Design a protein around this ligand. Structure first.
Ligand SMILES: Cc1ncc(COP(=O)(O)O)c(CN[C@@H](CO)C(=O)O)c1O
Ligand SMILES: Cc1ncc(COP(=O)(O)O)c(CN[C@@H](CO)C(=O)O)c1O
Lengths: 405, 405
């Protein structure tokens, strides 16, 4: 940085603290990642100065010839990555991508069926303090109490009983592959649209390591910043038949001018995801998650669903008599970042919880491999089994520093 | 740029075209501006990697100590700039800032009174193809047919008749000072909240060149990218009594994770606006707009409301027998960027219009002064009075190039 240090010492000092923090900690928050320098440069460009309401070649302002090229690169690369017939790369976030699909096919008060929030569903999938839950009537399907795998008979029974206009599949904390074919089969049975929110697994889908929802869902939403390793923002994928309606939902529907500099960064990230090394990266994410899962089981931890098929895992801390809040707090003391997270049928509230959610996308981006996963599990075992020992916590801090350098 | 050119030649080439385009044209779109290098560096930072749902000191993720500092700098500097009791700097855009206020005080179907869209009101102030118009019952107040100044008796009559739960004041194309005191007096008479969308005039308000809506409105919304000259995004200002509700409307209400890198850029822009030179800049914006207005009247153009009190002006092209669409297209041929814009009581549709909207914030940022305004007016006169002469258009192109270098 050159101009920021001189113009704003306070903002620069804080950014520099954050940059060093990102290097020093072991980041296991499942929705995080580290973007490339090229992606950051695209978002730090002069494209923030351009008003470009509308779409490429159909803008409401002149002079959009070059931001049109950028937006089409993003759309075409997204289409090649996921094999979608249409893409909308304007959503400002995952929340706005979801909001626009809901705005497209639902009327106020319509019934929507989504994953139980305490079993893995997202806030925008029906929380009563979110617009989804306030605007529409959400009903939920759950996972089996023992396997923790989505109960497809429960999805079907709820759909047939409540007759939702839309069914939402996917999650913020589900460690197994989701069967989109079954979701579409149930949606067809009850005449509902199917929306798949693939935010967490988008990079895995792009690398062929998770079944692609595109062929089964009417609408596919996602964030560009989780396993896809792009800038923070959203995207909607859909068949040509809903293209005009989805585009109108985003604009003039729910947003105004798009963030053209962030769209440039989305294009860059999509170009990175089309390369062979991104596929190797994604495989290492899943391999590392499996290894981490196995190593944690070796320390004596119980994992929701017994392991993982993707980038994330959930530890059920009940056997250790710990809440997720306690575990999150003590891991923060040693330099390991996780989130408390409810587990299916959790006896505790969502503010306390009985679990922690962990993902490997970020540590894989920084170059960690199987040996590092074994050590991370060993450190978490040392800390969580010895929460009252300051000597064990200091040892963990030294082991974390050895991993991050 | 260093990494982008090598990672993505296509995206880099397009960005570079856009950068050169921004230098080569005379940018008169009233909502645009050019951000500083420091603001761009803040948005091109590693803060895009951090999940930070919640607010400073009340986050849902650990490790937010440093992004908390950045967000508080933004909030505190916003509060000093506008004298507000509370600020929310998380809105992703002006559309999301407006959406959150509506979500805070309105129920689906409530009546809202806002400025007629064809007299200056914004799309998010009731358009039937926007969420505002679909979700709520909007009614509109207009400007006087001759003075083009808001008819405060019309605001009051519509409020008393329709009994809106909320009244919205401010606009995307109103060239005169808005009397917020009268708006609050009418709102109090009918028991309605008052929301002021100051997006266009925020920089002028910060420099004391436009009356501040903060003391009169329950809620003040704005974009950070127009006259405020910040990164693209939104912000909400309000009294301490609605702080918790406004914060909850943004999150968990209508958004998810905030764009922390864009919030860092908002802080930077707010720091720039607190400096004495920003006040001098803003004065030049208004001085230049007046000068430009006067010079256009000298060429024979009619201006909506007869001139301007702010950064923008509207030309009524009926006297020249031109539509705004025709004028916008021929000015684009010579390197001058304007927007077609309806004028009050326009006989043409919003897609054709009888006017063009022009603003001076961007050319003032690049250093243009009174002599440049006279020349810009002279060039627009030459072009619009000689639309069929390729010699006049080529002369205009050479005069535009002389101004931009
Ligand atoms: C499945 C899923 N869908 C949408 C979002 C929202 O994205 P924003 O860009 O944050 O609006 C998420 C976000 N998940 C966060 C917590 O909300 C996470 O840590 O999982 C999501 O997971
Ligand atoms: C008064 C006013 N309020 C909100 C917005 C929306 O902001 P976004 O960041 O674009 O969502 C605007 C935007 N105005 C644009 C056209 O929509 C302009 O050129 O005026 C606004 O003016």
């Amino acid at each position: 940085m050159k101009y920021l240090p001189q113009q704003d010492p306070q903002v620069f000092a804080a950014i520099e603290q954050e940059r060093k923090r990102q290097h020093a900690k072991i980041e296991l928050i499942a929705s995080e990642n580290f973007v490339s320098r090229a992606v950051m440069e695209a978002q730090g460009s002069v494209l923030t100065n351009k008003y470009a309401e509308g779409y490429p070649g159909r803008r409401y302002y002149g002079g959009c010839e070059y931001v049109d090229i950028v937006e089409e690169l993003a759309r075409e690369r997204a289409k090649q990555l996921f094999g979608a017939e249409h893409a909308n790369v304007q959503p400002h976030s995952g929340a706005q991508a979801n909001m626009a699909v809901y705005f497209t096919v639902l009327e106020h008060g319509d019934t929507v069926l989504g994953m139980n929030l305490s079993h893995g569903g997202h806030l925008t999938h029906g929380s009563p303090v979110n617009f989804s839950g306030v605007q529409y009537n959400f009903v939920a399907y759950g996972v089996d109490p023992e396997t923790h795998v989505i109960d497809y008979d429960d999805v079907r029974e709820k759909a047939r009983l409540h007759r939702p206009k839309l069914i939402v599949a996917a999650a913020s904390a589900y460690p197994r592959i989701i069967d989109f074919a079954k979701f579409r089969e149930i949606a067809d049975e009850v005449g509902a649209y199917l929306m798949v929110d693939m935010a967490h697994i988008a990079g895995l889908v792009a690398a062929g390591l998770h079944p692609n929802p595109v062929p089964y869902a009417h609408f596919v939403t996602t964030t560009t910043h989780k396993t896809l390793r792009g800038p923070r923002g959203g995207m909607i994928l859909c068949q040509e038949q809903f293209a005009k309606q989805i585009d109108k939902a985003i604009f003039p529907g729910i947003q105004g001018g798009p963030l053209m500099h962030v769209i440039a960064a989305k294009a860059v990230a999509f170009g990175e995801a089309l390369q062979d090394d991104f596929k190797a990266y994604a495989k290492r994410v899943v391999d590392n998650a499996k290894r981490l899962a196995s190593a944690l089981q070796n320390e004596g931890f119980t994992l929701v669903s017994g392991g993982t098929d993707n980038h994330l895992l959930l530890v059920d801390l009940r056997p250790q008599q710990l809440t997720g809040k306690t575990a999150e707090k003590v891991l923060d003391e040693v330099g390991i970042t996780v989130n408390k997270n409810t587990i299916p049928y959790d006896p505790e509230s969502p503010f306390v919880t009985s679990g922690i959610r962990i993902g490997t996308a970020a540590v894989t981006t920084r170059g960690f491999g199987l040996e590092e996963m074994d050590e991370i599990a060993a450190i978490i075992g040392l800390v969580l089994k010895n929460v009252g020992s300051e000597q064990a916590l200091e040892e963990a801090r030294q082991r974390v520093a050895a991993l991050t350098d």
